[PDB]
Amino acid sequence: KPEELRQALMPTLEALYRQDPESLPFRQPVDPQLLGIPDYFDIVKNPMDLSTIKRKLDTGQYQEPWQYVDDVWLMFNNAWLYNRKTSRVYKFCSKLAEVFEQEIDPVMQSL
Amino acid sequence: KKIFKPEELRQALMPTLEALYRQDPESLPFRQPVDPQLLGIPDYFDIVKNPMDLSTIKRKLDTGQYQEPWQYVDDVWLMFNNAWLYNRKTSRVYKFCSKLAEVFEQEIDPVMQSL
Numbered sequence: 600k601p602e603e604l605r606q607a608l609m610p611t612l613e614a615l616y617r618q619d620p621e622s623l624p625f626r627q628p629v630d631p632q633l634l635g636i637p638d639y640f641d642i643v644k645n646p647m648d649l650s651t652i653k654r655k656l657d658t659g660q661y662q663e664p665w666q667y668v669d670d671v672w673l674m675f676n677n678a679w680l681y682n683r684k685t686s687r688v689y690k691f692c693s694k695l696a697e698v699f700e701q702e703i704d705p706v707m708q709s710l
Numbered sequence: 711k712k713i714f715k716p717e718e719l720r721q722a723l724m725p726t727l728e729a730l731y732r733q734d735p736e737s738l739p740f741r742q743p744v745d746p747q748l749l750g751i752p753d754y755f756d757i758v759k760n761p762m763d764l765s766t767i768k769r770k771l772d773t774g775q776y777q778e779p780w781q782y783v784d785d786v787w788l789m790f791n792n793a794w795l796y797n798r799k800t801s802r803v804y805k806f807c808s809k810l811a812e813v814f815e816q817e818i819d820p821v822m823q824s825l
């Protein structure tokens with residue numbers, strides 16, 4: 600059931616929000632104009648961020664855990680792609696990806 | 711937006727994929743589709759809902775299944791994503807996966823910067 604999924608997945612997501620500073624650039628959608636990065640949507644075809652994932656989860660749009668996971672991977676993949684390995688966002692992203700693997704694994708298990 | 715005809719797309723992307731494939735030994739567990747019967751991990755398919763591997767990606771590229779670069783990148787990520795999820799951070803194959811990510815990132819960057 601939707602709330603059953605939401606209850607099982609939401610802590611996963613909260614684990615991502617609560618990483619300071621690492622989640623700071625992932626909490627809103629990337630604004631290429633406002634960030635001065637006009638080539639963003641030339642490289643990143645399908646953007647994803649924490650606010651978007653939360654809104655989908657909150658509103659029943661993942662019928663199955665793996666679809667939720669796909670959107671979290673997409674968010675990491677877009678950031679590793681666009682950003683330099685040396686950059687702040689790229690390393691924040693790496694941190695969040697470890698936090699996410701750690702939390703998502705036993706949730707998939709009991710689910 | 712560069713528009714890439716099918717042959718251009720192949721010659722822009724194919725060196726990306728050869729780069730992964732010659733990674734020895736890191737690419738070996740990635741050359742063929744994970745066989746959960748062979749390997750005894752038949753809960754692989756309970757965790758990995760859409761499998762992906764080098765042989766599949768080469769077939770999709772060889773048979774015109776990609777029109778733009780981001781679609782081939784999606785599949786490359788999907789192969790890495792599956793392996794990071796299923797494997798433990800401590801395993802040989804998970805560490806293989808990240809080495810392959812590093813290589814793929816270096817190789818595809820010039821492609822992404824040209825579009």
Ligand SMILES: COC(=O)N1CCCc2cc(NC(=O)[C@@H]3CC=CC[C@@H]3C(=O)O)ccc21
Binds near residue numbers: 738744745797
């Ligand atoms: C992408 O890989 C995976 O996620 N799995 C899940 C668990 C570990 C795993 C092991 C193998 N076996 C091997 O690598 C074999 C021994 C060492 C060299 C290559 C051999 C081969 O089989 O060619 C294949 C696939 C996966």
Ligand code: NA
Binds near residue numbers: 693696697
């Ligand atoms: Na990582």
Ligand code: NA
Binds near residue numbers: 696697794
């Ligand atoms: Na990772």
Ligand code: NA
Binds near residue numbers: 808811812
């Ligand atoms: Na990586």
Ligand code: NA
Binds near residue numbers: 679693808811
């Ligand atoms: Na990475």
